[PDB]
Each structure stands twice: as C-alpha cells, then as structure tokens.
Amino acid sequence: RTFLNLTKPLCEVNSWHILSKDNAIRIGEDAHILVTREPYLSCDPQGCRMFALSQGTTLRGRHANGTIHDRSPFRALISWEMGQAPSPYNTRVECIGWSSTSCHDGMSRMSICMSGPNNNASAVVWYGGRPITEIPSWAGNILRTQESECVCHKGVCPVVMTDGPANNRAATKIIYFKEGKIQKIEELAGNAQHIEECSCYGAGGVIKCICRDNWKGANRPVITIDPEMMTHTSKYLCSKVLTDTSRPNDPTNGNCDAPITGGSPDPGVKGFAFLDGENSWLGRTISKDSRSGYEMLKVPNAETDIQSGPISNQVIVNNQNWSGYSGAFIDYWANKECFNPCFYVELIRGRPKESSVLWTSNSIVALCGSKKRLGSWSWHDGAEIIYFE
Amino acid sequence: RTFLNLTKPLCEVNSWHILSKDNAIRIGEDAHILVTREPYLSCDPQGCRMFALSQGTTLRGRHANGTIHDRSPFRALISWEMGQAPSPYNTRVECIGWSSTSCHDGMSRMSICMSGPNNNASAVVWYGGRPITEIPSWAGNILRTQESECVCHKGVCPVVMTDGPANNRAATKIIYFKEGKIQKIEELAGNAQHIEECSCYGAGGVIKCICRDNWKGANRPVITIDPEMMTHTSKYLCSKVLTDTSRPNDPTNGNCDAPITGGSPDPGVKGFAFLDGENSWLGRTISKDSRSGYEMLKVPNAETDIQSGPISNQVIVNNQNWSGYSGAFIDYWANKECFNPCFYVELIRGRPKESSVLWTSNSIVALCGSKKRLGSWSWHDGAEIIYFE
Amino acid sequence: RTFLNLTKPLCEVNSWHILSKDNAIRIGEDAHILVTREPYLSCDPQGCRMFALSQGTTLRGRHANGTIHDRSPFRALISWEMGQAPSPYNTRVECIGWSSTSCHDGMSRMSICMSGPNNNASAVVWYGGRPITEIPSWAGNILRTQESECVCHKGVCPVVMTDGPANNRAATKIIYFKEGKIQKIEELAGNAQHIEECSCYGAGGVIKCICRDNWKGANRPVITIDPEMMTHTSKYLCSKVLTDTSRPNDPTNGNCDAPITGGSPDPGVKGFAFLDGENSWLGRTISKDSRSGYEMLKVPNAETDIQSGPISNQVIVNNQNWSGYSGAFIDYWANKECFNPCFYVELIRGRPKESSVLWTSNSIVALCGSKKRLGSWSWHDGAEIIYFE
Amino acid sequence: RTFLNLTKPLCEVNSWHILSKDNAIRIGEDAHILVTREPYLSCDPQGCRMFALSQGTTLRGRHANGTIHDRSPFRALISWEMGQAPSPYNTRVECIGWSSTSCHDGMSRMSICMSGPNNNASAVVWYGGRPITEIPSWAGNILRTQESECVCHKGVCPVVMTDGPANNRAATKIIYFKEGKIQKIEELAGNAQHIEECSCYGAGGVIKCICRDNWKGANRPVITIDPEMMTHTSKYLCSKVLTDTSRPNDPTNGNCDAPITGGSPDPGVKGFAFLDGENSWLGRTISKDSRSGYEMLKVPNAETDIQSGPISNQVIVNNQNWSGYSGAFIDYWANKECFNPCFYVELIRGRPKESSVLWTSNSIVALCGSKKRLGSWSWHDGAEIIYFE
Ligand SMILES: *[C@@H]1O[C@H](CO)C(O[C@@H]2O[C@H](CO)[C@@H](O[C@@H]3O[C@H](CO[C@H]4O[C@H](CO)[C@@H](O)[C@H](O[C@H]5O[C@H](CO)[C@@H](O)[C@H](O)[C@@H]5O)[C@@H]4O)[C@@H](O)[C@H](O)[C@@H]3O)[C@H](O)[C@H]2NC(C)=O)[C@H](O)[C@H]1NC(C)=O
Ligand SMILES: *[C@@H]1O[C@H](CO)C(O[C@@H]2O[C@H](CO)C(O)[C@H](O)[C@H]2NC(C)=O)[C@H](O)[C@H]1NC(C)=O
Ligand SMILES: *[C@H]1O[C@H](CO)C(O[C@@H]2O[C@H](CO)C(O)[C@H](O)[C@H]2NC(C)=O)[C@H](O)[C@H]1NC(C)=O
Ligand SMILES: CC(=O)N[C@@H]1[C@@H](NC(=N)N)C=C(C(=O)O)O[C@H]1C(O)C(O)CO
Ligand SMILES: CC(=O)N[C@@H]1[C@@H](NC(=N)N)C=C(C(=O)O)O[C@H]1C(O)C(O)CO
Ligand SMILES: CC(=O)N[C@@H]1[C@@H](NC(=N)N)C=C(C(=O)O)O[C@H]1C(O)C(O)CO
Ligand SMILES: CC(=O)N[C@@H]1[C@@H](NC(=N)N)C=C(C(=O)O)O[C@H]1C(O)C(O)CO
Ligand SMILES: CC(=O)N[C@H]1[C@H]([C@H](O)[C@H](O)CO)OC(C(=O)O)=C[C@@H]1NC(=N)N
Ligand SMILES: CC(=O)N[C@H]1[C@H]([C@H](O)[C@H](O)CO)OC(C(=O)O)=C[C@@H]1NC(=N)N
Ligand SMILES: CC(=O)N[C@H]1[C@H]([C@H](O)[C@H](O)CO)OC(C(=O)O)=C[C@@H]1NC(=N)N
Ligand SMILES: CC(=O)N[C@H]1[C@H]([C@H](O)[C@H](O)CO)OC(C(=O)O)=C[C@@H]1NC(=N)N
Ligand SMILES: *[C@@H]1O[C@H](CO)C(O)[C@H](O)[C@H]1NC(C)=O
Ligand SMILES: *[C@@H]1O[C@H](CO)[C@@H](O)[C@H](O)[C@H]1NC(C)=O
Ligand SMILES: [Ca+2]
Ligand SMILES: [Ca+2]
Ligand SMILES: [Ca+2]
Ligand SMILES: [Ca+2]
Structure with a gap:
C-alpha cells in the first residue's frame, strides 16, 4: 500500500453502464433494512462500498414514523458491501452524526460526521476507524459537509464544509487533512456565492467539486482545488444547461460568475x-421543479462556454419516478490508465412526495463510464408504496 | 497462486452422491430469503459457491408478487456459501442484470450480467470484483448468456452468448476473456441451428458446452471449444435419448447434425x-412435456452414436415433484487426479405451475459423481405450497 | 499446522465448569432459528464450534410441523461458532444427511453424513470441506454413525458406523480414515452385542468409545481403539451404575462382558x-425412564470394577426439565499439559414429551472438567412452551 | 503484537466528543435485538467492541418478559463490533454468566464470567477464547466483578471481585492474571468499606478503579493498583462532589477515608x-435519587481535596431521560502520545422505571475526551415506549 495520487487523466465516456443497485425499499418491505438518506459510494484498494446516514431504525419499525426529519442523535454514517441493502446485520458504523464525508487515501479510510444541536454542532474526523480530530462550529448554524466522498492526493484529503444560513451568505471552509489531522484551513475564495454538499473527484492532479448553491443559483458552483499547493478557486458552471433543482427553463446563455x-x-x-x-x-433531475427523474447530458465545454448544450443524453431514472441526491465517486484503484467517472443517484421514497406513509427513506443505483455506445433503461426504485399502507 | 489448466481427464461416474441442498423455500417461508431463479454453482481454489438471479425482493415480501417475470431492473446475480439459503444478509452481489455467467480462472472470478431493455441490453464483464468491459447488444433482441458457470484454461475463459429471436435463427458468439478483457470473438459455426443457456465443463484441454435449441431441437446442441487455439465446432448430441423439455418420444435414432x-x-x-x-x-426432466422430475441416464457414446440408449438411471427428483433448469460444474481444484462431474437442478416453486401463490422462485440441489454404486432418493424441494396460501 | 497426536493424559476432574449454552429455543421463539436435533461440539486449532442436524426449517416456520421425524431429504449437518444460536445466517453446511460425525485431525476437518432411504442410505466423507469418499449401505438398514465428534491420531481418524436392526443384532464397522480416504475397515469384535451412537475421546494414545446398545443393555458398551495398529476390542462398562435410558434400578453388581x-x-x-x-x-439422565434431568457421577474404576459406585455427583439439568442426547469432546489444542474432558447435553423441547406444539427441537449446554470444587446449578433449556402455543 | 504497557499519560480533556451510539432499543423494536444490561466497551490493537450481558432472548420475544431479573442460566457475556445493535447474528459469546469483566493485554483478550446460584457461584477465566481457570465462591454470596473492562500492563491484568453481602461488610479480592492464570490474590486493603463494580483505567504505570459502595457511601471508593509490584491501596474519592446514585445534596466537604x-x-x-x-x-447521573440524566464534571484535584468543586460541566443525557451504569475504557492502542479517556453510559429502558412493558433492557452511548471546547446535546436512547405497548 501507498498513498493514491491523482496524476491519471479522466476516461473518455460515451455512455453509462450499471455498476450497482441495492433495491433497499423493496427488500426493506419485509427484511430488516435500516431507514436511510444522503447515500453515496466510496472505493479503496479492495473494491467499493455504499455509505448513507442511518436514521437508527428499520423501515418496517414503528420508529420509521418521523424519518422526514434531518437531524437527530440517532443518525450515523454506515457503510456496507456494494449491492447489498443496509440491514443492522451487515453495516459498519463509520461515525455518529447527521452530515458526513469519507474517502480512502490509499493507506486508510477517513470518515467525518457532524452531530450536535443546530447552534453547536461538531465534526469528529476518523482515520483507520479511530477518532483523530474534533472541530467545533465556527459560525453556530448547522456545521455540515459533502454527503458524498472526498478525494485524496499524496496523503492530503481536502473536505469542503459550511456553517451558517441555508438561505443567505454562509461561511464555507476548505480543510486539508492528512491521516485525520488538520494541515490547513481556508475560507472560501472566488465567485461562488453559496456552497453546500460538494460532489468531488480528481483527475490530472486537480480536484473538482460541483456544489449546491441553496441561496440564489439554479446553476451549480464549482470549486477547483490544488491538493499539493493546498489552494482553491471557485465560480459557477458556465453552461446554459442548468443542473440545480428547482430551476427555471434553460436561458440562452449561462453565467460563469454569478x-x-x-x-x-x-x-x-x-x-x-x-x-x-x-x-x-x-x-x-428531469423535472425542473421536483426531485423526479434523472438524466445524464454530455455538454462539451460546460465549464467554459456559456452557450454549451447537450450532444447526447441518457435517461437514468424516468420522469414518472422519484430521484433525489446525486454525487460523484471514482474507483481510483482500478486497473486502468485513466480514472473512469461514476455517479450514484439516491432514490427517495415516502415523505414529502408520497405521504401515504409516515417515513422517508431511499434506495441506491450507481453507474460508471463506458467508451461504448450502450443502450439504457430506467433504474427507478421499484417498490409499491401501496404495500406500505 | 496459478491459472487453472484443464489438463486432467474426467472421473469415471457410476452414480451420483449428494453435494448440497439449500432448502431455500422451506426456510424462506419464515427467514428472510431472496426470491431467485436461474441458479447454479461455481468453485474456486478455496471452495464452492451457489449463484442465482435475485428478484430484488424476499419470498414472504409483498414484492414477490409478479416474480414469474424474467427481466426487470431489480434483478442481479448474487453468490453465497454453498448449502446456505440466499438471504439479504449472506449474499454477495456479483453484477446487475437478468442473464449471467461466472467462473474462476485460478486467480480471480469473472462474472457477467446482461441488463437493459429487450432491444438494447448490454453485458458488463466483472473481474476480481471490478467492472472491466461492457458489450453492446449486436442484434437488438435480449442479449443473453449461459445461466451456469463458464470454464477457464491458462487464463482464457470462453463464454457463449446469443442475441436474436427465441423462436428463430439467432446470432451466437463465442467470446474468449482473459482477466475480463476480450481476446477474441467468434460467430457460431457448425450444425447447431439455435443456441441458448449452454452448460459447460473442461477435461483434457477441451471445453464442451451442452446447450438449449429453443427453435427446433428436442436434442441438445453441443459446442466443442479449444481455448488455446480459441476455436470451436458445433453439432447436436447424437443419442436417440432426447434431453430437452418439451420433447417427443425418443425416436429409433437421434441425429448428430440436425x-x-x-x-x-x-x-x-x-x-x-x-x-x-x-x-x-x-x-x-422425467416428464417429456413439463418441468417435473429429474433423471440421470448413463448413455454410452451419447456424443457419437445415434443408437445409444441408457444402461443405468438415477432418479434425482421424483416425477411427482417440480424441477427446472440444470447445469454442469466441476470443482477443478479438488485434490484428485481427475475432474469429477457435478450438476445442480433448480427446484421451481410457484407460478405458473402453482398458481395458488403470487410468486415464482426456486431452491437448489447439487450432486457429484461417484465410482461406487450408491443408493438414492428424491431430492425434491420439500416446501408445502398450502403454507403460503 | 501438524497432525494431532494423542500424547497427553486426561486432566483430573473434580467438578464441571460451564463452557457454552446457546439458548436456541428462547431465542428461536422470535429470531430466525433453525430446527435441529442430534447436536454436539468439536474443536480445531482455532477454537470450538457447535454442530447439529438441521431440519431445513426454522422453529417458528410452518415447516417446523412434523419435525419429530428423524430422516428426510431436508436435513444437513450444520456447524456454527460456539455459543451462538443456529440461524440461517450463521451456520456452515458441513454435509447433507440425517446422521453425522465430524473431527479435525490437526490439519483439516473431516465431516461424514448419511442420507437416502432406509434400505439404500450412503455416507459421503468430506475433508477440508470437499467430498472425498462415498460408502454405500452394507446391510440395507439405515447406515448410521456417531452423532458426536470422532478423534484423530497422527492423521488417522477412526469412525464407528452401524447398519442393521435397531432392535436386534446389527453389522457395526470401525472405519479408519486419513484425509477422507479409507485406510482399513474392521468388523466389530468382542462382547458388545449392539453398538450405536458412539461418544469417543482420546487420551495417552488410546481412543475410547462409549456407545448405545439399543438391543439389550441398560449398561453402555465400550469400544477401545488403537489408532496406530488400527485394531479394537469391545465389552461393556463394568460398573453397576447403569447409564442408558430406559434402564432398571442399579443392580448389586455390573457386568463387564454382557x-x-x-x-x-x-x-x-x-x-x-x-x-x-x-x-x-x-x-x-436423572430419570431412569425418561430423557429428563442430567447428572454427572464420579465412579472410580467404573470401567473395570463391577462393584463401583458414585463418590460424588453434579446435577447438570434438574429432573423437572427435559434433557436428551449427550456426548464427549475435547479441545485437543488447548495450552494445557493434559486433555481436559468436555461434554454437552442436548436439551430437547417439543414432541413427543411436549405435544402442545407440532415440532421437535433442542438447545445446547456444554461443560468441561475442573480440578476445583465448583458450585453448580441447573442448565435447563429455559424456554416457556406456552409462548409457542 | 506485544504486551500493552501503560507507559503514557492521560490526555488533556476539556470537552467530550461522540464515539458510538448503538440505538439498540429503537432498532430492537422490529429487528431481532438481544435484550442486555451491564454494557461496556473494550479495545484491542485492531479496534473497539461493545460488550453486554445478554438475557438469552430478543427484545420483541415473549421471553423478554421478566428480564428485570439480574441472574439466570440464560445470560452470557457477548461482544459485537462497536456501533452495531446486539443481534443473534452479529455477537460473539465471550463466556457464560451474569457478572463479567473483559480486557485485552496486547496479545489476547481475557474474559471472565461468574454464574451459578447465589450461594455457590464460580468464575470462569478465558484467554484467547479458551477457558484457562475456575474460581469458586469464597463467601457463598454472589461472587461478582466489575461490569466493565479490566486493564493490563506487561501481561498482568488486575481484576477486582467481591463475594458477600450487598448491604454489609463483604469480601473483596484483587486477582492478578497473566494469560488467564492467577499470579497473585490479595484481600482488599485500605479505607474503602464496600467494593462493587469497579471502573478501571491505566496511565503512567498505575491502575485506578473507581467503584461502587453499596453499603454506606454516596462517595465512591477508589483502588490504586500497582500492576508491576501487584500491590494496591484503597480509600474514597475526596471531593464534596458525590457521584454515586442515591446520594444526598453535595456537602460542604467530602471525605477521603469514610x-x-x-x-x-x-x-x-x-x-x-x-x-x-x-x-x-x-x-x-443528574438526578441524585434516580438513574436519570448523566453529566460530566471537571473537578480539579477531586482525588486529593475535600473542598474541590466543578470548574466545568457537560450534559451527556438530559434529566428527562433514563441513564444507568457507566464505566471507563481507553483505546490504549490509539496512535497518540497520551491515553485518551472514554466512557459509556448504559441507557436503561423498561422496568422498574417504565412498567407499561414487561422487559428491561438498554442501549449504549460512548464518548471520549477532546482538548477542544466542543458543543454538545443529549444522547438519550431515543425509543418511544408507546410503540412496545
Ligand atoms: C455549547 O456547548 C459548549 C461546550 O463547549 C458550551 O459550553 C459549556 O458552557 C457552560 C457555560 O454556559 C459551562 O459552564 C460552567 O460550569 C462550571 C461548573 O459547572 C457545574 O458545576 C456548578 C457548581 O457545582 C453547577 O452549578 C453547574 O450546574 C449547570 O450544569 C449542569 C450539568 O452538569 C446542569 O444540570 C445545571 O442545571 C446547570 O446549568 C454544573 O453542575 C461553573 O463553575 C461555571 O460558572 C459555568 O456555569 C461548561 O463548563 C462549558 N463546557 C465545556 C465542556 O466547555 C456552551 O454552553 C454551548 N453554547 C451554546 C451557544 O449553547
Ligand atoms: C503517482 O502514483 C503512481 C502510481 O503508484 C506513481 O508511481 C510509478 O512511477 C515510477 C516512476 O515515477 C515507477 O517506475 C513505478 O513502476 C510506477 N509504479 C506503479 C505502482 O505503477 C508515481 O510516482 C506517483 N507520482 C507522484 C508525483 O507521487
Ligand atoms: C454447590 O454445588 C456443588 C457441586 O454440586 C457442591 O458440591 C456436592 O455436595 C453434595 C452434598 O454434600 C454431594 O454429595 C456431591 O457429591 C458434591 N459434588 C461435587 C461436584 O463436589 C455443594 O454441595 C453445593 N454447595 C452448597 C452450599 O450447596
Ligand atoms: C413520480 C412523479 O409522479 N413525478 C411527477 C412527474 N410525472 C410526469 N411527468 N408524468 C412530473 C413532474 C414535474 O415535472 O412537475 O414531477 C412529478 C410531479 O408531479 C411533481 O413533482 C409535482 O409534485
Ligand atoms: C409435479 C407433478 O406432479 N408433475 C406432473 C407429473 N406428475 C406425476 N406423474 N405424478 C406428470 C406429468 C405428465 O405426465 O406430463 O408432468 C407433470 C405436469 O406438469 C402435469 O401433469 C401437467 O402440468
Ligand atoms: C421433565 C419432567 O417433568 N420429567 C418427568 C419427571 N419429573 C419430575 N421428577 N418432576 C419424572 C420422571 C421420572 O423420574 O421418571 O420422568 C419425567 C416424565 O415425563 C415421565 O416419567 C413420564 O413420561
Ligand atoms: C427520566 C425521567 O423522567 N426522570 C425523572 C426526572 N424528572 C423528570 N423527567 N420530570 C428527574 C428525577 C430526579 O431528579 O429525581 O426523577 C426521575 C423520576 O421520574 C423518578 O425518579 C421516578 O422514580
Ligand atoms: C445538515 C443537513 O441537515 N443537511 C440537509 C440539507 C439542508 O438542509 C440544506 O442543504 C440546507 O442548508 O438538505 C437536505 C435536503 O433533502 O435538501 C438534506 C440534508 N440532511 C442531512 N444531511 N441529514
Ligand atoms: C434472458 C431471459 O429472459 N431468459 C429466460 C429464458 C428464455 O426466455 C429463453 O431461453 C427463450 O429465449 O427462458 C427462461 C425459462 O424459464 O424458460 C428463463 C430465462 N430468464 C432469465 N434469464 N432471466
Ligand atoms: C439414523 C437415525 O435415525 N438415528 C436416530 C436414532 C435411532 O433411531 C436409533 O438409535 C435406533 O436405531 O434415534 C434417535 C433418538 O432420539 O432416539 C435419533 C436419531 N435421529 C437421527 N440421527 N437423525
Ligand atoms: C451479580 C449481580 O446480580 N449484580 C447486580 C448488581 C447488584 O445487585 C449489586 O451490585 C448489589 O451487590 O446490581 C445491578 C443493578 O442494576 O444495580 C446489576 C447487577 N446485575 C448483574 N450484573 N447481572
Ligand atoms: C407518528 O408520530 C406522530 C407525531 O410524533 C404521531 O403523533 C402519531 O401518532 C405517530 N403515529 C404512529 C402510527 O406511530
Ligand atoms: C409474564 O410473565 C409472567 C411470569 O411467568 C406471567 O405469568 C405472564 O403471563 C407473562 N405475560 C405474558 C404477556 O406472557
Ligand atoms: Ca439553488
Ligand atoms: Ca428445444
Ligand atoms: Ca439400551
Ligand atoms: Ca452507595
């Protein structure tokens, strides 16, 4: 074992192949499947695992009632073997909390969870399954992080965190970790005006994080991070193809800087x-308004050209089905000359969209790049809400 | 340690001993057992494992309703320790799809799943637990493969695949894989008119695949593969003893070439x-019309002699019980001077044969050869359908 | 790793300490616990495991109905980590059948199961978890074996098997195994008139088997095996203290030879x-009529002296509670200068004795020698049968 | 692997961070969770596990009825991976009994359980998963031990045990183990008048145990053990800050010696x-009367100064929520220059405090120190009792 470095280029991607699907809600109708949300995947030299925020109750359990609610002392980051559904019998507790990130540096995994009350949350940074570092809230307003994997280069792993309003200017920091210990802290710089929940991947010695501006923008902020100089810049996706949810129709021109x-x-x-x-x-999401459907769109020069639009699409989840969160990961330990992009989509079931049940949960589907021109179908959740009534 | 070489001859077989039985439906009446179909076993240097295509639901779950249906986005190939029943707790997800094959080359396991719509399925080829290769559909008609184990020699694992009509001429390929990467693709050549669902084994450097002609033959096609040369031939089993289901009475002579x-x-x-x-x-199967009973017939020179008939028979499942698919496997890593034949029978329960239940599923029995003359009995599923009403 | 050699003497025993208890019926009332019977324990260099004959159903399952029945195609030898209850999620299938034995030789574990109809049963012998040898019925009447562990010495593992009437003279053999292969077969010799279900242990280069005479004696037969020469003798336990169940009052004198x-x-x-x-x-058993209570009695020279009586006693299960089978095992790999005796008691619940339920199952208790004078209490099953009604 | 040596000082602690929370009652409402009480945690070179005394029945099982009872033949010490709820499917059985301690010495784990009747209990001492030693009751009155982890130094693991009255002068011993063998036995010396249930840690070659005086004191006895010399002293904690439950209001002065x-x-x-x-x-506990709430109090010189009061506080469980037992553990194998303090709180649910249910159980929370000033919230159990009615 060695520290991963990120000096390979990204692979060419002409379509997306099915990597994994857990069918958690379908299985959780009967077997003992934990209630979850905010899932993702993360890899190490050995393979890949699914991650999510448990609600500390099973789906059929009476405590599923009220699981719409985001933040409780009963949530923890759990991980498990890619493909299986999360039960209390097959899941590793990574840390305790209601917001997380995790990544493997080539040597060991670092996992980070925020917990606590809204005015007084804290991060605990684990490395090798051991607690290393604690960080208190700096702005006193729901300290939080990626909800998907971080990325490490040469032992250095940057993590984007935010503390402050959901609906106004907040305080975002980039913290640089090595073996769970803080190497540098940096305030957000650049033209991104609001930063939440960054999806990050590395290629070519650089880490790109694509985020959620929850304040004003229906276009997504982008933070470019040098993990050697331990510096960063920020702006917005240039493309007119707007990718946040709740968004207007696509304008004729996007906006790189606002x-x-x-x-x-x-x-x-x-x-x-x-x-x-x-x-x-x-x-x-396929809907401009709501978390339904999911589509992949190849937009050459999306990062630099305000006029760029799709040259190809793939429907991942059709617009008659619920989606949710989505994020980046890559298996950096694959036996290839390039880093192949992967992504997951969180498939949210129950409240608020389906309120004939008392709970909110989700399942997971995950896909990676193919150089081939693969056919596709919808990878929706597939559970019958009527079975839970 | 090393690539499996198919050097050894086949062991003499005079009868069949019990290897394994999972009792999955009996157990699944209570415990949390996955709905499945299309099982097989495969071995590696450490031991043997059971495989099947999950339906993404447990047997007692309400989602088990409609599981007669062959292809959905909720199926995946799962593997598990031989003899246990498949639950969400003890299963490994090998790949995602509704047609599969799997084999170990002596170093690592290759696993292959097709998924996608009928007019646009694709294969994803997995090696050592990672996705290596994708293959588009060549004929836009349910790209599909073996549904039992492939076989490797010096790192080369041939797989037989078909795309095209179920009731007409189709397009079959032999694909030769080494570490999940295509070395060669051949089009089917020889006298086999239709090819599906090949059951393969090797001995003395030759791989034989005994397949299903869904178009015409109640005799089974036989493909013979040289994995060094990476070439094949095809024809039909010569014996007048027909072994497909829905067959006529055995004629006076079989046909080798038609x-x-x-x-x-x-x-x-x-x-x-x-x-x-x-x-x-x-x-x-014992019934010439339906999938019931199972029998083993010692038919000297079946592959060469149009007049060859049984000189002994072992009843595996009595004709009062449901069977289903059957397939070949060998423990190539046995401490033996020969490769001993083994097989499984899939014990299908529910639909369409038992319509008092809303689901279709199966269990597994597995047997290997013995030089001795062993007594026997029926190894039927053993579940009571009245219990599921 | 090296072959186990039986060079140590037995440790001195003055009472019995608790080793394990699985509370399988209490736990199986809700959790998913397999119906079992004929349990035992067996150790290897890494530790000890619990073993039993599964009925291929869980205890709360509808298929638990009829589990009084001894032989079916749905039975398998299962082993699991000592002190756990046996569920579908934690048990390894050792072999398939309704009579077993198992022992580790210092390198790998040998397991043997009989299956088949009464007049045509066979043994399959496994070594390192792979099948090695098959042995067909010699007398066409329920080929059967120890139902507790076998013992090895320099890789030679003898096994006692019987084929023939339960109620009359049968054909017993002693089979000498090494790595699953038969080295010698001997027919039973000496004074034991009937032999079944031998509980065997080794100390100082000699193996002793304490068996069940189902035909005549309420005294137990004793077979003495030389594992080196591969020879045996047999007679009866000499002591007047009669240990079989159904037995009359203890007479004034025992009988060594009848x-x-x-x-x-x-x-x-x-x-x-x-x-x-x-x-x-x-x-x-404490009761001379029924399978209730269990007691240990120190009877010096029980083996050789027709007049030998108890000098102390420890109640293991009180006579108000159900017992069942009991048997010998030793951790031959403990870091001790002697071999310390252990035993288990099968704690049978349900039919025939408890007919308010439709099933038969058991739980387990295991205790080992102490050189100390330990207090004792009853280790009865502890499930409440009314919960199951 | 070598023997752990208590060579490092205790870390500076200013605050407590969340380590683990198993949410066992919430999860056990549906999923098959073992009823427990008397939990703790203990670490080894590889990670930390949770430990509890199982009641040999699951939480929703009918045998959960009556689990207020402290002592029965159906209890066992079980260990599981930290963060998981204890189920039949993920727990190791450490030993059998109703009082326990356990600790790892850097090489292997020592685990001790007492079982038996009140007047004739015995301890079994286990090492590396094998029983090594047996200790009979010396006073005929519920031989019993710490209910949390012991601590080892140069292979020498002291354990505090008591036998005799709960409400009068009892007979306490300090027993020094090495690889499960008794090195030395001392009778309690010093000014502690009653000793039960010691919580022990190590720093700079010294072991401190803070115990429970069930007889007269609302202050806590403290034993200071030299593991090298194998000698101890005892007194009471000096501070006016009384920490047993039931206690009076804190006095003006405490008392080191009565x-x-x-x-x-x-x-x-x-x-x-x-x-x-x-x-x-x-x-x-926050309550002086009852096992409700839990608070950490930084009391400089608590060990030497009768007038020492709190300089800071952390609410661990609010006084509207039930707590229970609490105890010390340290990850002695952390990659840190100091031994960092951790503790768990047993969060008791059911009887006597909540008698709308027929059972008594618990969940677990654990926390470790921080040099930081971190915010906090209440880590209550989180289960709704109405759901179990
Ligand atoms: C966010 O959480 C952070 C944690 O870093 C906050 O910080 C804590 O802040 C407090 C000040 O607000 C701390 O307080 C002080 O306590 C010491 C000693 O306290 C104990 O002893 C005295 C005398 O015996 C009692 O009167 C105290 O009674 C308070 O605490 C107990 C719980 O133990 C509770 O049950 C009582 O009702 C009562 O509220 C107590 O037992 C005093 O000498 C001092 O004057 C002051 O009160 C605390 O030390 C500090 N903790 C840590 C850890 O840093 C912050 O409060 C939170 N911030 C926000 C915005 O909520
Ligand atoms: C980046 O990480 C790669 C992968 O390990 C790396 O390593 C190799 O390069 C050297 C020469 O520079 C070799 O000759 C080895 O054969 C290669 N090793 C492997 C395992 O492929 C780079 O050195 C790392 N680069 C930096 C800047 O850290
Ligand atoms: C506790 O239990 C132990 C063991 O059973 C014990 O010892 C036995 O004593 C009785 C009566 O004196 C006997 O006759 C047995 O032969 C003894 N057995 C052993 C194994 O030593 C004590 O009697 C019991 N002590 C108390 C106080 O009950
Ligand atoms: C799963 C589902 O029913 N999805 C609906 C989808 N359906 C179709 N286009 N058919 C259309 C939208 C939409 O674009 O508004 O999103 C969904 C929707 O109605 C809302 O989000 C409003 O609550
Ligand atoms: C399991 C079972 O009972 N199977 C039937 C079998 N049974 C007996 N011969 N007992 C007889 C036949 C048959 O004669 O065609 O095949 C089976 C059949 O499918 C049908 O009869 C019609 O569905
Ligand atoms: C567990 C139990 O209650 N067992 C009964 C037992 N009970 C008591 N001694 N209390 C009495 C005896 C006996 O000693 O013969 O045997 C048992 C018995 O059922 C029968 O003898 C009739 O089949
Ligand atoms: C968890 C809970 O409700 N605990 C009660 C709590 N008070 C309140 N939460 N209101 C505080 C006390 C107390 O300080 O004595 O008393 C507790 C209590 O109910 C009893 O001691 C009853 O025996
Ligand atoms: C820390 C936290 O509670 N994050 C929230 C997040 C959120 O509120 C915002 O992004 C607004 O600031 O939104 C959502 C969401 O579904 O929009 C889920 C997250 N839930 C959890 N991570 N548990
Ligand atoms: C890919 C696919 O759906 N294959 C079918 C297969 C089939 O339809 C034919 O061979 C005719 O083309 O038949 C059966 C069958 O039971 O006959 C099950 C297979 N199901 C699954 N593999 N999932
Ligand atoms: C092979 C077989 O069926 N052995 C029987 C055994 C038995 O019948 C005799 O000893 C008489 O010959 O009795 C019992 C018994 O409880 O008496 C259980 C065993 N059950 C099982 N091993 N499965
Ligand atoms: C051996 C035993 O039963 N110990 C009891 C213990 C106790 O009774 C006393 O400390 C008085 O001596 O109290 C408690 C308790 O909740 O107070 C739990 C323990 N239960 C168990 N450890 N099982
Ligand atoms: C769900 O939770 C609600 C608010 O806490 C509530 O009051 C409701 O009764 C409860 N419902 C069920 C069915 O548990
Ligand atoms: C509770 O246990 C007691 C003691 O045996 C009892 O009798 C009662 O019926 C049990 N209650 C239930 C609901 O089982
Ligand atoms: Ca936005
Ligand atoms: Ca056909
Ligand atoms: Ca008898
Ligand atoms: Ca007290």
Missing part, C-alpha cells in the same frame, strides 16, 4: 458533473 | 450432459 | 463417560 | 471517574 436565479419551490438538491472539456457530463 | 423436432407445449429448458465415450451421462 | 437388561419404555439414548481409573465420570 | 451516608431510594450504581490532578473528571 448565480442565475429562478425556479420554484425548492432552493436546491445535491448534484454533480464531470468537467473535462469535450468529455464533459452534467447530471440533473 | 435437430430432432417435436413435443408440446414448451420450446426448451436449460440442461447439460457429461460426454466422455463410455463414461457419458445425460440429465433430463 | 448386557444388563430391563427398563421401560425406551431402548436407548446416546450418552458418554470419561474412563480413567480413579478419574472416571459417568453421565446419565 | 463513606458519606444518605440518599434515597437506591444503595448504589456502577460509575466511574478519571483522576489526574487538575485534569480530573467525574461522571454521575
């Missing part, structure tokens, strides 16, 4: 994009 | 044979 | 003794 | 403190 406003009724959702000049893909 | 047609109402079932001159055995 | 008859209503139960001069301990 | 009487209705609860000069912290 939030483009509009959309009703939701201020944001976690999302992602891979930005590689011509080899660029943007994900989004 | 289908023996007939029988009603079903076109085919996956089956297998071991072919080694004198030491040749054929499995078939 | 059975002591009487008792009602039942012909026999599996049981055991440690036999070592002054250091001799006889288990038996 | 119990301080008073409080109602409870004679005692298991508790803990870390004593390190200015860096000293005392746990106690």
